[PDB]
From TrEMBL, chain B:
<protein>
    <submittedName>
        <fullName>VP1 protein</fullName>
    </submittedName>
</protein>
<comment type="similarity">
    <text>Belongs to the parvoviridae capsid protein family.</text>
</comment>
TrEMBL record, chain D:
<protein>
    <submittedName>
        <fullName>VP1 protein</fullName>
    </submittedName>
</protein>
<comment type="similarity">
    <text>Belongs to the parvoviridae capsid protein family.</text>
</comment>
Length: 549, 50, 100, 50, 549, 49
C-alpha cells in the first residue's frame, strides 16, 4: 500500500446560497505538518519559578510561576480564523453578512511520511543523509470525550500557519498541575522585604496526572495508512457582524423642539427644562437629557487593573471589551494586545525574536466609558454641586493620588446590557469549551463561540518510538534512532450566515483596500515582496452599523 | 444597595445610570431607591384648571 | 454538659475560586512595571478615614465573566431542599440549601 | 486555565526548574498596553470566583 | 502488504454494569516489545554450582545449584497485575468491589519490524547504521496444550513493563532439568568438613529434553503479517476483596454481663467463672473465654524456617501467609519479601544494580499467631501451672536454646480454617497452572487464581535465523547477520466483580491518596519527577473488613 | 469514572487518635453516648477546563 497517495489537497472556500438570503459557507484547508521526535519519552512534572523577577519589590504583575505536566505528545489545533479563510473572504463576509454561526467540522490526516537521519564523511566534514523508513509508524488520537485538560493553542499563537503554501509544526501537549503559590504585595521602593514568595507541593486532594496512553484510543499509521474523524456538529449561538452606536443617551424619543433653525448653521431649542414633560428619578422640578429616564444601562463601569488572588497567585481579573471613547481609555475598557509570530501574521522581513504586536479596540460605541468625565453627586440632588457634594476622578481613594473611584467602582447590575465582543481575524480564537461549573459565565472573552454541549475533541499526535539494537529498561540512557515525519492535515469547517439588508439612504461604511500609502489598508500589506515576504494584519470585523433600539 | 446619582459617560455625554425602583423605607431615601418623577400635561392627567 | 451547644465551621472545597485578601490589589491607569507608592491601592491603605477598613471590604468584582462552583451539601446537619422566593426576578441559587 | 507557556529550557535534575522565553519576546495576549507578557497579566476565558 | 499498520494501540480499562451490582471489567493493554538475536542458535544443558558459597560451613540456605536447559526462544508473559491496571483502578476496585474473578483472555501480535546493523567510518570512528530488512521474519508459537514446563515470569520479575509509554523486552525461555544433588548440614564454626556437596549426572528414568520446534505449531511472520490467539476462558474461583478480623476468641455469643458500667471509663463484669454456664473440653469446674469451646480453629501454628530436603537439595518449606500480630512475627507468619527492578516498580532515580525491596504483611487478622505468647499445659489441667507442668517459648527443644517448640510445632488439623492470601498489586502474579499430581494442594501461595482446567498456553517468540553468504553445517563458527526487531503486543483481560454492600453505621477504612509527606500514601510516589522518573509501590488490596461468623 | 493515573483522595475512617476521622467518633461509649460530626462531601477532584 506504499507509493500511493491517501488524500487530496484542498484549501478552497465555497459559498452556497439558499433562499431567504441564508448562506452556507464551506471552508476547506490543508497544511503540511512537520513532526519531530519527542524531547523525552517521558511525562514530566515541571516547576517554574521566576524568583529573579518576583523577588523585586512591586513586581507582582510580572509573576508567572506555576507547575505543569509535560507530555511527549504534540497536538494539531486549527482553532483560529486565520487557518480557514483568505483575507479577502473575511472582507467579503464582513461587508456582506449580518451574522454568522458555526455548523460542522471535519478532519482527516494522510500521506504520512517517516524518515531517519545518519551521518557520513564528505571531505572530512560530517553531512546528513536522509532515508525513508517504511515500517515506522506515527500515532494519532482524539479526546472526543474531553477527558484531558482543554488547551487552546491560539492561547499561545501555536495553531497552524495561516499560509497554505508553507509547512507547519504542532504545538506540544502540556497542562497545568496543582500546587499552591503565595506572593506578597510590595511597591517601587517600599522599605522592608518581600515576605512570602513560595511554591508548594502536591496536594492529596487535587493531584491530577493524566496519560494519553491510558485515556484515548490510539491509532497507529504507517505511510500507506490514513485516518479521519467523524463529523462534529456545533451547537452554538450566532454572532452579529454589525456594530452598535446608540448610547444610554440616544434611547427613546428625543425631546420636542420649539424653535427650528433657519440656516444650516443654527441650532434648535427645546421647551424650558422647568416646564418640559417627562420622567426622571430625581426630586428636582425640571428635566434634561442627562437626568432623564432610559430603558436600561448600555455598557457599565469596570474596576480597572484589579489583581485578585487565590491559591496560586495573583492575576488580572479579565475585562469585557468595549469601545475606548474620546478619552482613549484603552486599558480601562479592556482592549486586547496581541503579540504574534511570523507564521501567524508578523512580517517575515522583521528581525530577531522581536514579536509583532497589535491592540484591538472594540467597536461597540454605544457602550464605551470615558473615565475622566465620570462622576458621582450627592444624595439629594443639587443644581450645581458644592465641592463637598461631588466625587470626581481627581479625588484620591484610600490615601493615594492616581487612584480614584473609577478604579474600584463596578456599575454592573440588572439593567446592564451590552454587545458581544467581536471575532478578530488573522489571530483570533474561534470556539471554546465551557467551564464545568454549576454556575456559568455569560460568555468568554477569549472566543466568540462557546460550545453549549460537549466540545470538539483535541487531536493529539506522536511519532512512534524507534529503537536501536541496544535496549535496556533500567538504563537512564534511552538510545533511539533519529527520526522525524510529515503528513497532511485537511479540515472542513462549515458555517451558516445571512445576507445583510439595505435600509439607510446614506451610503455605509465598508472595508476596502486602498492605494499604496499609509492608511491601514495599503493593499501592499497583503502582497508578497520581491523575495516573497508575507504579512497579515487584522481587519475590521464589524464595518456596518445597526440600530440598537 | 445601589450606587446613587452615578453619572457615567461615553461618547455622547454623561448621563444618570438608571436605578431599579424599590421602597424608600423610613429613611425616605427616595432618590436613593430610584422612585420616579412624572411631569405631565393637562391632556395626560394634569388638572385643566391649573 | 449544660446547654453549651457544639459548633463547627464549614470551609468550602472549591479551591479554584477562593480569595486571599492580603494579596489582592489595584494598580493605576496605564500600567506601570513596578508601581509608585501613589499608583497602587493595597490592603493597608484605609478607606473613608478608618484603618482596618480597606478596599476589600467594599469591593465587589461580580460581573458577566464571573463563574463558580455551587456550595456543597453538608452531611449531618445540612438542609436538603428549599422553596423558591415568589419574586419576578429570582436569585441564581440559595446558600441555605442545595436543591431549590 | 488554558495552555501553560512554552518552556525553552528543561530541568536536568529533579531539583531544577524550567524556563520560558523572555516576557519581552513571548507570544500571547493581554489587555495591557505593555510590551511583554506574563502569566498573571495574561488573558483568560472568564473569572473564576470573585 | 508492507507500509500498513496491522493493529490498534489500546491500554484502556472499561467498566460495564449489569443489574444486581455485577460488573464486567475489561482490561486492555498494549506494549512495544524489543527482541534481540538469540545468544546461541542452540539448546544448551547447563549446570550451575556455587561451590564458592556452599562450601562454607553453615551456609546451606545460600545454596542455589541446579542444572537447566537453555532455549534460544524467548517468551511474552503478562501474568502480573501491574501489566493490566492503572494504580487508581486497583484503588477503585479494592475500595468498591467485594470480590473479583477471572473470565477471558485475548492476545494478538502486530506491526512487526525487523532490522539489521552494519558499521561505517565517520571521522576514523566506527558508527552504527540501521537498515530495514523486509524479507526477514519473526517466529511465534503457543503451547496451548501445555506440553512445555510452565515457567511464570513473575517468578523472576521478568514480565512486561508496568508502564505503557515505555518499551519492554521478553524473558528468555529456560526450564529445569533432572540431576540429583546432595548437601550436608553444618553450622557457624563446626569443626570437621563439609562432607558432601555433589552434583549428579543425567538419569535414564527422568531425563526430559523438549524442543519448541518439535512440539508447537510455529507461525512465521514478516512485517506485513499479524497474529492472534483465540479467546481463552478461565475456570477459576473468585477472590474476596474484604479482610477478616474475628479470631478464635470472638466466635459466638460473648458472655453475659451482670454489672453495667456507669461511666465511660468503667468496665463491666460477668458472672463468676465458678458458676457460669457453658462448655469446655477441660475437667475443671469453671469456665473462661480462653478455655471455652469454639466452632473451629481460625489460623494455625506453622513450624518455622523448616528446611526440608530431597533429591536435589534442601529448600525452605513454604508458609501460608497470615497476619503478624503485635509480636511482629513476620517470618513466623510467612510474610513475603519482594525484590524488584525499575521496570517493575523500583524508583528510576535509584542507583546501581541495587534492587528495591518490600515486605507484604497479610491482613487476615483473625488468623495471625504470636509466638511469644503461645504455650502448652500439661495433662490434667491445673489452675496456675507448676514450672514443670507447662512448656513455653523459652524452654529449649533438642539441646539448643533459641529453638523452642514453636519451631517444630504444627497445629494444622481438621478444624483448621482460614483466609486465602490476597493479591499484591504492582508485582503480584495473577494465575497459575495446577500441579499434575493425583493429590492436589488446597491452594498456591505464589498466586490467587489457580486454573481448575488446562491453563493458558505460554507465548514463545524468536527471531528467524538470518544467514550470510558463508555457511557450513559443521563449522563451529555460526556467522550470521546482526538483527533485531520490535512488535506490539495487545491483550484483553476480562474480569467480573461484584459491588460491596454498606451495612455498618460507622465509616469504614478506604485506600486514599494523601498530601505530600511521609505516610505511605504520599501522592507524589505516584507522580513523575521533573525528569520523568516514575515509581510504583504496592497498595493495600483488602481495605474493608467483613464479619467472619 | 476513573481517569487519573495517580490514586485519589477518598474519605476514610482512621485508627483511634486525633485525626478528624477517628473511627471512635462514630461509635457508642460504654454508656451509649453517640456523636455525629460532619464529613467531607466532595473528596474527589475534577478538571474544570
Amino acid at each position: 500500500g506504499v507509493g500511493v497517495s491517501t488524500g487530496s489537497y484542498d484549501n478552497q472556500t465555497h459559498y452556497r446560497f439558499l433562499g431567504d438570503g441564508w448562506v452556507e459557507i464551506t471552508a476547506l484547508a490543508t497544511r503540511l505538518v512537520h513532526l519531530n521526535m519527542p524531547k523525552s519519552e517521558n511525562y514530566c512534572r515541571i516547576r517554574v519559578h521566576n524568583t529573579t523577577d518576583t523577588s523585586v519589590k512591586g513586581n507582582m504583575a510580572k509573576d508567572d510561576a506555576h507547575e505543569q505536566i509535560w507530555t511527549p505528545w504534540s497536538l494539531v489545533d486549527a482553532n483560529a480564523w486565520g487557518v480557514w479563510l483568505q483575507p479577502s473572504d473575511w472582507q467579503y463576509i464582513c461587508n456582506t453578512m449580518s451574522q454568522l454561526n458555526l455548523v460542522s467540522l471535519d478532519q482527516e490526516i494522510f500521506n504520512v511520511v517517516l524518515k531517519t537521519v545518519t551521518e557520513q564523511d564528505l571531505g572530512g566534514q560530517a553531512i546528513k543523509i536522509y532515508n525513508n523508513d517504511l515500517t515506522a509508524c506515527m500515532m494519532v488520537a482524539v479526546d472526543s470525550n474531553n477527558i484531558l485538560p482543554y488547551t487552546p493553542a491560539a492561547n499561545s499563537m501555536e495553531t497552524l500557519g495561516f499560509y497554505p503554501w508553507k509547512p507547519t509544526i504542532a504545538s506540544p501537549y502540556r497542562y497545568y498541575f496543582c500546587v499552591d503559590r503565595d506572593l506578597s504585595v510590595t511597591y517601587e521602593n517600599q522599605e522592608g522585604t518581600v515576605e512570602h514568595n513560595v511554591m508548594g507541593t502536591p496536594k492529596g486532594m487535587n493531584s491530577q496526572f493524566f496519560t494519553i496512553e491510558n485515556t484515548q484510543q490510539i491509532t497507529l499509521l504507517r505511510t500507506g495508512d490514513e485516518f479521519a474523524t467523524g463529523t462534529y456538529y456545533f451547537d452554538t449561538n450566532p454572532v452579529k457582524l454589525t456594530h452598535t452606536w446608540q448610547t444610554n443617551r440616544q434611547l427613546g424619543q428625543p425631546p420636542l423642539l420649539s424653535t427650528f433653525p433657519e440656516a444650516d448653521t443654527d441650532a434648535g431649542t427645546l421647551t424650558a427644562q422647568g416646564s418640559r414633560h417627562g420622567t426622571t428619578q430625581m426630586g428636582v422640578n425640571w428635566v434634561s437629557e442627562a437626568i432623564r429616564t432610559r430603558p436600561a444601562q448600555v455598557g457599565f463601569c469596570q474596576p480597572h487593573n484589579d489583581f485578585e488572588a487565590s491559591r496560586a497567585g495573583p492575576f488580572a481579573a479579565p475585562k469585557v471589551p468595549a469601545d475606548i471613547t474620546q478619552g482613549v481609555d484603552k486599558e480601562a475598557n479592556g482592549s486586547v494586545r496581541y503579540s504574534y509570530g511570523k507564521q501567524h501574521g508578523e512580517n517575515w522581513a522583521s528581525h530577531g525574536p522581536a514579536p509583532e504586536r497589535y491592540t484591538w479596540d472594540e467597536t461597540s460605541f454605544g457602550s464605551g466609558r470615558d473615565t475622566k468625565d465620570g462622576f458621582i453627586q450627592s444624595a439629594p440632588l443639587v443644581v450645581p454641586p458644592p465641592l463637598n457634594g461631588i466625587l470626581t476622578n481627581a479625588n484620591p481613594i484610600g490615601t493615594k493620588n492616581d487612584i480614584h473611584f473609577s478604579n474600584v467602582f463596578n456599575s454592573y447590575g440588572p439593567l446592564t446590557a451590552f454587545s458581544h465582543p467581536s471575532p478578530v481575524y488573522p489571530q483570533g480564537q474561534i470556539w471554546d469549551k465551557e467551564l464545568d461549573l454549576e454556575h456559568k459565565p455569560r460568555l468568554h472573552i477569549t472566543a466568540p463561540f462557546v460550545c453549549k454541549n460537549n466540545a470538539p475533541g483535541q487531536m493529539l499526535v506522536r511519532l512512534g518510538p524507534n529503537l536501536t539494537d541496544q535496549y535496556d529498561p533500567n538504563g537512564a540512557t534511552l538510545s533511539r534512532i533519529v527520526t522525524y515525519g510529515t503528513f497532511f492535515w485537511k479540515g472542513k469547517l462549515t458555517m451558516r450566515a445571512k445576507l445583510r439588508a439595505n435600509t439607510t439612504w446614506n451610503p455605509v461604511y465598508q472595508v476596502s483596500a486602498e492605494d499604496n500609502g499609509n492608511s491601514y489598508m495599503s493593499v501592499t500589506k497583503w502582497l508578497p515582496t520581491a523575495t516573497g515576504n508575507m504579512q497579515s494584519v487584522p481587519l475590521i470585523t464589524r464595518p456596518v452599523a445597526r440600530n440598537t433600539y
